[PDB]
Amino acid sequence: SALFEPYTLKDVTLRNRIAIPPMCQYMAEDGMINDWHHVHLAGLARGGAGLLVVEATAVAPEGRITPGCAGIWSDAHAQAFVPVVQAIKAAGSVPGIQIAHAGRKASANRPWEGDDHIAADDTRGWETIAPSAIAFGAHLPKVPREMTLDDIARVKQDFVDAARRARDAGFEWIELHFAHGFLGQSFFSEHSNKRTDAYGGSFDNRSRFLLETLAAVREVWPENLPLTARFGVLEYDGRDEQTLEESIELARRFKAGGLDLLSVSVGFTIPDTNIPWGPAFMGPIAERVRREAKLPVTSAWGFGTPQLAEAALQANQLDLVSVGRAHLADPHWAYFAAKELGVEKASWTLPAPYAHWLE
Amino acid sequence: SALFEPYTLKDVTLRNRIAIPPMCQYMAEDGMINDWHHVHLAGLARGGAGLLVVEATAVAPEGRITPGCAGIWSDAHAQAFVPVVQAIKAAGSVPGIQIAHAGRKASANRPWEGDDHIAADDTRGWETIAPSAIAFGAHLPKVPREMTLDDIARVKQDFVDAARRARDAGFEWIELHFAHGFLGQSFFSEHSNKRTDAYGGSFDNRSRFLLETLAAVREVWPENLPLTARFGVLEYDGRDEQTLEESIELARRFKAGGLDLLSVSVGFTIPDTNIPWGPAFMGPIAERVRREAKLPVTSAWGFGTPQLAEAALQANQLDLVSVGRAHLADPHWAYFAAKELGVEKASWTLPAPYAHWLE
Ligand SMILES: Cc1cc2nc3c(=O)[nH]c(=O)nc-3n(C[C@H](O)[C@H](O)[C@H](O)COP(=O)(O)O)c2cc1C
Ligand SMILES: Cc1cc2nc3c(=O)[nH]c(=O)nc-3n(C[C@H](O)[C@H](O)[C@H](O)COP(=O)(O)O)c2cc1C
Ligand SMILES: O=c1ccc2ccccc2o1
Ligand SMILES: O=c1ccc2ccccc2o1
């Protein structure tokens, strides 16, 4: 099975091609993770996936999506990850982390508590920042504060500090969150970036925050550990071919700047779009990015059907298959997939205290 | 759905009729549990089952099955359970524990490391104890030491101390392991008990260890928390009707002595038997015990098919359905069962960070 072939990137070897993508849990308190996360993540690692990427973890308090988001903006925040990293490694999975800044989509309620911008008089909320003072709209109506050049310098340094902390906590894989309409994506998109300084206007200027942040992170992140990013390569906003062309050009510049793998997604920069949701719908666009930027990729959405994951790999659409919600449903999805695909000794996807009894 | 109806026993209410029976993990060190158990048990509790019974936990070092078995023979052993109990409660499941003594089946290898009695010159092994100096046979050839009256007194006190420790660690449900050919079962069975003192020969004498142990435990175990036992009610040894009759009589004496629920099993006292394994095969015998002893019951073996669990409950064969291996395969089996049986808002079997996304 292609799904169960190992994968080596830099000095890291994944035991199979199943990646668990970042999935916010909304269970942290002032950014500090707790036994929710410990058990959730260790349980997933034991389920057999080769790579487990921790949820969007804010590089600064105002870069959380919600009051429940994880953070890594101090050394105490980082040290809370150490036992979890160690548990993921004990289970034979590779521990990764997505470091993030929610930009104009920050200061929102948890998804089961309204999913919308927090009311102005709610003591939990905060002012959001963005390249330009323009609201997302819809359920996120707050107008963010336009960043100063000093704010840009500060946020880049927060990404550096976050990467340094992730390294020192023992993570073996890092993902910069430049997707999903959050701060990085919003610098790239002309919808959200109306700046007329070095950080907006032209393709080079819109790319600048993302490229500078990547380069700054690269200074502290070990060359022997995968350096990755998530990036929305189109919006489904009626501008798709031009946007895809620019996104692929940026992917080439990421590769030249030391990016080892790109997690290919959708922008979600603005609400007025027409996204053609369907099983593995991103496969062909991931394949195009992979081919035209000559860079390994992953993608997500609907790959919880094992045969579809297998097909995407065999078609060389993807190098790793990211499987999210199916792992919330069943932490042992990798074992289910091994059985489905007829892998020999499928139960030994799991550790011995489970595997022995399920043969 | 009957499977998703709550159940109240004494002061304890289970949110549904799904019980996770004790399942040895073989991951403890000198009886001390660790993060294997913490994550395993907390993950299961979050999966939605109403009751989670911790694996056979030895009341004395020589009563472990294997070198990997959990123990509760000192206060330090008991205190290791406290964070796990607290995690199970945080997830809304009821924490239980099975306290045990392996008798002549002790000093064995882990099941994936031979499953047989440990060699005499292996430094991990120990002398086993039993009512009579008679080996099980087959892969368990060691002849146990015949217990003295002082040994009987000591082991009863070890059960008391174990129950006291379980209580003080916060467990809300206790199960005495009088099944599966271990010490208690072996006192009851004429195959293994050839004593001619007060603890063998007659039905009353063979029952005595079990009844005295129950009564002694009852002195320290709170009256408002379920007091239960697991007991093998037949052997499939060609003596089934007579053995069933005696076992039901013992069940009546357990009930009279304060037992709240009986987990009905097979004896596994000797190897030369013909057990008719099949899905829910114990249902009719559990039903007979339930009816003739007028005592709530659970049973196990093959109830991981949700419709079969439901049928057993609707037929009043069982009060709780024990589902073991299916939970090793999928910690979230209760969610799977809720979907299968068409329960409304099935995803809310799970906590919010999962349930919201799986609706
Ligand atoms: C509960 C949950 C939280 C999510 N949090 C993030 C996040 O932290 N970062 C991110 O880039 N994507 C996040 N996503 C997107 C997932 O990583 C994944 O791309 C999406 O769920 C599609 O994959 P699936 O169909 O296998 O679930 C989240 C999705 C879910 C369901
Ligand atoms: C891994 C494992 C460990 C077991 N350990 C115990 C134990 O600690 N105590 C016990 O009474 N039964 C133990 N059993 C029996 C289970 O409790 C259950 O009765 C049996 O697995 C049948 O249920 P199932 O078909 O749902 O798996 C164990 C079974 C398995 C598979
Ligand atoms: O980047 C993100 C962060 C959270 C999240 C939650 C649900 C769906 C997608 C998501 O993407
Ligand atoms: O009482 C027990 C203890 C361990 C065990 C392992 C596999 C099957 C049944 C078992 O029963």
Residue recorded with tokens 């159940």? B7
Number of Cβ atoms within 10 Å of the Cβ of A293: 23
**Which amino acid residue places its CA nearest to atom 8 of ligand 3?**
A23
CA A61 to chain centre: 18
Q: Does A313 lie at the interface with B, CB-CB under 8 angstroms?
A: no
Q: Taking Cα atoms as reference points, which of B86, B63, B82, B85 lies closest to residue B73?
A: B63
Give A336's contacts (C-beta < 8 A, 6+ positions apart): A306, A330, B330
The residue assigned the tokens 């349980």 is A43
Atom of ligand 4 at shortest distance to CA of B56? 3
Instruction: Decide if A44 contacts A205 (C-beta within 8 A).
Output: no
Residues in chain B after which the backbone breaks (C–N beyond 2.5 Å): none
Question: What DSSP letter does each residue of A195-218 carry, written as one string?
Answer: --STTSSSHHHHHHHHHHHHHHHH
Any B CB within 8 A of A332 CB? yes
Tokens representing B44 are: 């299961």
Nearest-CA residue for ligand 4 atom 8 is: B23
Q: How many CA atoms lie within 13 A of B70 on its CB side?
A: 26
* Beta bridge pairs of residue A157: none
**Three-class DSSP labels, B32-73:** ECCHHHHHHHHHHHHCCCCEEEEEEEECCHHHCCCCCCEECC
Q: Which residues contact B245 (CB under 8 A, 6 or more apart)?
A: none
Q: How far apart are CA A278 and CA A281, in angstroms?
A: 5
Task: Note whether A272 and A189 are within 8 A (CB).
Answer: no
Deposited resolution, Å? 1.1
Q: What residues are paired with A14 via a beta bridge?
A: A7
Of all protein residues, whose CA lies closest to atom 3 belonging to ligand 1?
A23
Cα separation, B303 vs B30, whole angstroms: 33
Alpha-carbon distance of B333 to B309, in angstroms, equals 12
CA distance B22 to B54: 5
Assigned token pair, B45: 């509790």
**A40 interaction partners in chain B (CB closer than 8 Å):** 353
Closest CA in chain A for residue B87? A35
Name residues 78-117 of chain A within 8 A of B (Cβ).
87, 90, 111-112
Give how far Cα A225 sits from Cα of A220, A250, A260, B234, Å: 11, 22, 9, 59
Task: Give the Cα separation of B30 and A273 in Å (integer).
Answer: 60
Alpha-carbon torsion, ordered A172, A177, A179, A182, to 10 deg: 160
The answer to whether the CB of B300 is under 6 A from ligand 4 is no
Task: Please choose, from the candidates A63, A184, A32, the residue with its C-alpha nearest in 3D space to the C-alpha of residue A126.
Answer: A63
Q: CB of A33 within 8 A of CB of A334?
A: no
| Ligand 3 center–CA A24 separation, angstroms | 7
Cα distances (angstroms) measured from residue A77 to each of A38, A71, A177, B232 = 14, 6, 18, 51
**How determined?**
X-ray
- Is the sign of the CA dihedral B212, B300, B92, B101 positive or negative? positive
Q: Where are the beta strands (DSSP E) in chain A?
A: 7-9, 12-14, 18-20, 51-58, 94-100, 129-130, 145-146, 173-178, 227-232, 261-265, 297-299, 320-322
Report the length, in residues, of chain B.
Answer: 359
Q: Determine contact: B2 vs chain A, CB below 8 A.
A: no
Instruction: Compute the distance from residue B280 Cα to the ligand 3 centre, in Å.
Output: 42
Alpha-carbon dihedral sign for residues B199, B200, B201, B204? positive
B314: which 2 tokens? 């609707």
Taking the CA atoms of B14, B19, B21 and B22 in sequence, report the sign of the dihedral they define. Answer: negative
Q: Which of B42, B350, B354 sits opposite A39 (nearest CB)?
A: B42
- Residues B315-328 as b/e (b if ≥16 CB within 10 A, e otherwise) read eebbbbbbbbbbbb
Measured from the Cβ of residue A239, the count of other Cβ atoms closer than 10 Å reads: 14
- A114 token code pair: 């309204």
- Which residues, 6+ apart, have CB-to-CB distance to A121 below 8 Å? none
The residues spanned by each domain of chain A are 1-359
| Beta strands at A129-130 and A94-100: parallel, antiparallel or unpaired | unpaired
| Residue set of the binding site of B for FMNH2 | 22, 24, 56, 98, 230, 302, 324-325
Task: Tell me the torsion sign for CA atoms A268, A278, A301, A7.
Answer: negative
Interatomic CA distance for residues A261 and B71, integer angstroms: 47
Nearest CA to ligand 2 atom 21: B324
DSSP letter string, A260-298: -EEEEE----SS-------TTTTHHHHHHHHHHHT--EE
Q: How far apart are CA B162 and CA B36, in angstroms?
A: 22
Type and span of the H or E element at B100: strand B94-100
Ligand 2 atom closest to B179 (CA): 11
Domain A1-359 fold is TIM Barrel (3.20.20)
Contact across the interface for A112 and B356, Cβ inside 8 Å: yes
- A253 marked ligand binding residue: no
CB A47 within 8 Å of CB B43? no
CB pair distance less than 8 Å for B332 and A331: yes
The two tokens of residue A204 are 């080079």
Is residue B117 exposed (0-12), middle (13-18) or buried (19+ Cβ within 10 Å)?
Answer: buried
Q: Ligand 4: which atom is nearest the Cα of residue B177?
A: 1
Cα dihedral B171, B178, B228, B280 sign: positive
Asked whether A24 lines ligand 1 (CB < 6 A), one says: yes
How far is residue B104 from each of residues B23, B62, B109, B121, B185, measured CA to CA in Å? 19, 10, 13, 18, 11
Phi-psi map region of B270: left, alpha, beta (phi>0 left; psi -120 to 50 alpha): beta
**Residue A97 to residue A22: CA distance in whole angstroms:** 7
Nearest ligand 2 atom, CA A354: 1
**Torsion (CA) A251, A253, A254, A256 in degrees, nearest 10:** 130
Helix (H) or strand (E) holding B18: strand B18-20
Cα atoms in the Cβ-side hemisphere of radius 13 Å centred on B73 = 21
